[model samples]
Target: MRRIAIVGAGQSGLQLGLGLLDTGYDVTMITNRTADEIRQGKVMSSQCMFHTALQTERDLGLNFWEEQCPAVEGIGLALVNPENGAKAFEWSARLERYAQSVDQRVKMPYWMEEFERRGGQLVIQDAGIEELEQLANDYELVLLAAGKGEVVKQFERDGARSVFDKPQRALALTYVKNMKPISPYSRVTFNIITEVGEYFSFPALTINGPCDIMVFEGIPNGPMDCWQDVKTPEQHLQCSLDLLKKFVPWEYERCANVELTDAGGYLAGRFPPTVRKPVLTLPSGKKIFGMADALVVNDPITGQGSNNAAKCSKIYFDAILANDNQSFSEQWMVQTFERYWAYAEKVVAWTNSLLLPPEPHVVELLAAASQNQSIASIMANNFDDPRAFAPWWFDADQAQAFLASKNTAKV
Candidate 1:
């Protein structure tokens, strides 16, 4: 069997680590906390996944909350006028396939325990750069999925391919016990404001029970910028409510009846969206590889973290299985990551595009989309396959052609 060591038991790490362990490979997972620590810890960000990513869990038998968690059947886009509590543009698209989210506090620990139960080894410790060097020597291949931090910085910058060098937004996430869900069917609500930035809510299964995840993605140093030092979910929810009232009154109203899901259901931070070289060389001249956010952390604008992590794990799994007869080397690592980058590049580009102020084409598309549910579905559903977006959604000519096609459909 192949030997693999995965560090940082977040989505990608645990996904691949347990996957390989089930496949009967010699696999070990290194995580900072034990399964209990995770279950009892604070809410670990809001993860909204489309059907495609959720299917990976199904395929792996890891989807334990399918029935209990609310199904996200659509996407709601509302550009609210900050001056008056009115929507300048609003449309909701029913997704072709549904989406769902389980609290990471619950999801990660279950996976960790499942990993341990299935005979997969767990190293309950953190891996600094020195530990990484040792792991690089011990396993045939070592993979990093530790999310954004110093572990990622060791990978030499692929400057030619790397985009902007700064954090794009300040993020605040809170999960609530009794917050109202938008009617009809479950949907991920995106409410974009003027200079205050974006607010979103979607259903999720957490430790307490089913709850809605409230997220604020703020323009750095702008009005929605107060999440850094919050000490509790009570404070986090209050501050979130307070910000909503000042910049997004409609959301403030929805949150008026809200209360924290539990003491452990909130998160706050600012992260730079980034892309790095997939392979890194250590002091001993050994090379290690990266997967998921450790390699490419896009801003939270598009809810792409778990989606990206799920997809890359499958991509890397395929490449590793295909090359089972050979040695896992630096060349193989790059080739594997490149296969993933082909898809991830599009994901990153699409996410980055949304974080910026709307261009004429964007406004035009949403304008057209408001009148055309087909256009809306295409935009909402393609978070599953971003490569399908480029030739159509991102260009002026193709966008016009799309509009023209809809015109012809009216007949």
Candidate 2:
């Protein structure tokens, strides 16, 4: 049996380990902390796991749908110009479902337990990549699924990639006891306050109950100040309340008498966007590959992070499985990187393009979609599976002709 060692007990690491185990590899997972410690005090972050990801889980026989807290039927996406309260495009769909209830700390450990049940091993330790060679000398492969850690820093090339650094705007969420579900699907309400700033709200799942997530974004030095001191859960709630009073008055009415507990808010700190070659050569001359980011964190204005992560993971895993137990040669590594990049590049480029405050071309396109039912249908279908956003799926001439139709009515 070929022995394989995987670092990181997070989603990707666990999934990759389980996949390798199914392929008859002797897999062992190493994490810094014990599984129980992770579950008891998990960090809070909201994410949406789409249909395709769920399907992957089912195929792997690691399905945890029953463990998910609040399984939603759909989502509502809206673009609003906060200055004039003008709606750009309000779209809702029921084609896909997402979870608000699952937490990475709990979900990942559960997967690890499943891996163990299948005869895999879990080692609780803090090890470095420098120690990987010795482990690989014992095992067939050492997989660094640990994500972007100090180990990854050894692979960093400052001049080879584009890096964008910015202080992430703050995000806060809380489960309300008495609030009723206003929409059948997940709801996203966007407010673009200025060229450099925005705010939004959505539904999420929590351990205690269904919750709402509120986010505020602006240039780092702007009025809101850095959410640095707001670290503890209590401070998080207070900061959210203070900020919400200034921006979203409606939230007060909706959440009135609903206590904002310690679980209410979380601060969004610094986010640096570094786009490098997906594969890197390690110090030991072995190849170190980049999987998805800690999460496919986005500008947050796009509402596309979860979709992008799932798409990238699927492509990466598929490419790896296609090449069974190949040596990590430069040629093989490059090919694997390219195969996954083909899908990731489109999604990342599209997201980067939209980072600019809405442009005239974007506004015009959205306005047209609002009026034409056919255009709306096209967009609705595209949102469920963003692969449609790729150039190959759309023809310029056909889209132009459809948009120019006079029968299109204002939605």
Candidate 3:
């Protein structure tokens, strides 16, 4: 049996390990902490797991799906004209069985436990590739699952990897108590004002009840300067409160008696742009692989990061399993990266296009969809899965066509 070692205990790493174990590989997962430490409760930003991800979990027989809350049924979206607080465009649809805001601390360990139950070894150690390279002679393969650590620097510098250097879009978010009666649906309300870039709010189920999460992207001053001279957690909370009062008055009206977390409202901070093509050949002739965004992160405005990671992991599994040598450095490395990039580019292109500020063309499209029932249905269906909206799928021309339809409807 080929001995395989996986680094990082996060979603992608765990998923890869489970898949390999199912294929009968002698898999061992190495992480920085033990299972108890993970379960002891760590504060992690929320991720909305879509239906496709749930399906992937079910297909894998991972058993951690039982702990997830089925909170992704109905989603409400509104493009708010922040100038007058009027909804520019609004749409709501049934999401049909997607879960929302899974607690990683709970879910991750559950998967880890399952991996161990299946005879996979769990080693709690802070080991890097340089150290593992020495042990390479012992194992059949060493999987670099170490997220965005400095260990992958060599590959990144060698042009085998690409990083999006965009500054972290600052966000102010909180879990509020006694929020207004939300319609048991995920609501994505966008607010665009003259001075402020864009602000958004959504309903997400936390450990508490359904809480409203407000996010402000691209604040005037950079996030670093905004936190300058701020020392304590209390000061950070006050700073966020002050900033919210100046910018997001609508959010303030509904949320009162707010309880701040220890980290204050710095829940969403500066995250680097998404990185692409993480696998590279090292100077020592060893292959370095990168998985998920430890370094490259998608613009969170689109909520595609987790989905992108899940899809990438699946592609990696297909490539790695097909390797006859069990060596990731073999021809399979090239094949795997090629397949993963092809799938990822479509998602990346769609997300990057949406980063633009709404134009007359976009407004017209939304307006038309608001009026035409058939167009509205197509638009609604498109939101759930964009591929259905266009034959070319993520092609720029298809995007223009979709926009033109909206524009024509507007006229």
Candidate 4:
């Protein structure tokens, strides 16, 4: 059995570690936080994942919360007129298969416990350069899956792939209960507030039972980027409600009796969507491979962080199994990341496009979706495989032809 060390017990590390353990590999998971600490810590992300990504967990038999977590049945978009606080045009399309969001506080601790139960070694300590050096020395393979950790700084920024160096959105999350559920069926309700930014909320299972996750994406230095001075949970909730009222009054109506799921149920921060080189060379010339967010971190605006991690883990898991007894060389590491990037590049392109102001063609497509269910359904399902966006999402000519095809094909 190959001895593999994964630094970081996040979505990618844990999922890939669990997969490795199932395949009889000697896997060691190193993380800064214990299961208990993570369970009691702040919210990690708006980890909503689509059908295909969810299937990856199911394949590994790691879909522990499938029955318990709330189903995100569809995706809806409302173009908000910030000037008048009215929806200019709105449309929704049910997903072919329901999506879901399991609060990381509930999911990670459970997965960590599962990782140990399956006979994998779990080490709780902050992994710095020295720790990574030790891991590289001992394990046949060392994977740095720590996205936001200091150690990940060792990976050089892939300037050609990374678009913006600065944070694009002032991101925030508020998990709460008693918000009115989406009628007809549950879905991620996204309110695009034009220049200000986006506000999306959906049903999710948190540590405190079922709740709605309010994800705020505020354009930097804009009106919605107002979380800096929020001093308490109450203040955070107030800011959330205030933004909803001013920008998305329809959503505000649903929050008549909402309250925090827990004091730790709120989070506010900002980070640039970055892509980094996959392999890092230790002082000893030993190579450490990076995975998921550690290599490619996208903004949460598309709600694809967990999805990307899950998909990346599956790709790496398959690649590792196929490599058999071959030495895990730096070339092999880069090749594996490239395989994952082939799929991930499409996701990154689509995600990065949304960070900028929408082009005329993109706006036209959004408008067309309002009248055409086929177009709306395609857009909603595009979350599963962002590659489906193709030339249509980026090119005006393709967008026009794509819209025309959908318009004519509707019967």
In terms of TM-score, the best-performing candidate is 4
Candidate 2 per-residue lDDT over residues 1-411, each given as its tens digit: 356677677666777678768878788887776777765654444555556666666677766644545554444445654455455566554543543335454476677788888788998877676666556566645556555455544445434334345424433343344434555555444444444355555555554445555666665565455466667666665666665555544444555554542253354554544455555555666655555553233555254554455555566567666667676555665676577556555555555555445555555555565556455555544555655655522445544554555344442
TM-score of 1: 0.96
Winner on lDDT between 3 and 4 is 4
Q: Any idea what lDDT model 4 has? A: 0.92
Candidate 1 has an lDDT of 0.83
Tens-place lDDT per residue, model 1, 42-95, is 877788888989998899999988988888888888887677767878888888
Error of 1 at 340 (Å): 0.6
* TM-score of each model, paired residue for residue: 0.96, 0.82, 0.79, 0.99
RMSD of 3: 4.1
Residues 234-345, model 4: lDDT tens digits: 9999999999989988899999999999989999999888999999998889999999999899889383889999999999999999899999999899999999999999
Superior by lDDT: candidate 1 or candidate 3: 1
Relative to the true structure, candidate 2 reaches a TM of 0.82
Number of backbone collisions per candidate, in order? Answer: 0, 1, 4, 0
Candidate 3 residue pairs in clash (backbone atoms < 3 Å): 73-95, 148-294, 275-296, 365-406
For candidate 1, the clash count comes to 0
Give residue 363's error in model 2 in angstroms.
1.8
lDDT of 3 by residue, 1-411 (tens): 467777778777888888888988888787887777766653344555566665666679863444535354544455654456566666655554544555455567788888898889998888665666643555666666665565544345323333345553554444443555446555455444433445555555444344555555654374323655565656665665565565556655555555543233235455555554556554455655567664345666353666656666787777776775555665666567667666655555555545555545555555555565555545544534443533433454655687667558667
lDDT of 1 at 345: 85
Off by over 4 Å in 1: 229-232, 301-303
